[PDB]
A paper describes a structure:
Here, we describe ZNF524, a zinc finger protein that directly binds telomeric repeats with nanomolar affinity, and reveal base-specific sequence recognition by cocrystallization with telomeric DNA. ZNF524 localizes to telomeres and specifically maintains the presence of the TRF2/RAP1 subcomplex at telomeres without affecting other shelterin members. Loss of ZNF524 concomitantly results in an increase in DNA damage signaling and recombination events. Overall, ZNF524 is a direct telomere-binding protein involved in the maintenance of telomere integrity.
Residue numbers in the entry: 113 to 225
The structure:
Amino acid sequence: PHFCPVCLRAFPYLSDLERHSISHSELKPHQCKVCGKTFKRSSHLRRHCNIHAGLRPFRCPLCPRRFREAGELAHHHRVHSGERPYQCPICRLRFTEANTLRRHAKRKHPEAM
DNA sequence: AGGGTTAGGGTTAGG
DNA sequence: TCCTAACCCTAACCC
Ligand SMILES: [Zn+2]
Ligand SMILES: [Zn+2]
Ligand SMILES: [Zn+2]
Ligand SMILES: [Zn+2]
């Protein structure tokens, strides 16, 4: 395997080690020449380039909202299905999105959750 | 005060 | 094994 010099995590392949190593650096070697913003990873720049095309591809059949990815439309569908699968173990309230529950825990239960 | 929205971080599935 | 990008996740902004 291949271990990292910083965190000393081992990885199966060399490509696995080199892509992880970017996380420990601060260089942003990618710049969008449309708006000027810089980016850390090639995939960040290419995802950001999609913004300048104007319209996200994934349309919700039930409302006018659009999304970059299929997974983000699926999560959005909970708005319509009414599902709240993220339940706080302390207060037992149910939330639609995991980040809503996380921000709820840190604000309402600072004694960890 | 709560969480919706957008954009950007790292992470992982699969071609 | 490598690479694209969809994925998971959170900061910032704001209704
Ligand atoms: Zn490392
Ligand atoms: Zn740009
Ligand atoms: Zn919708
Ligand atoms: Zn709670």
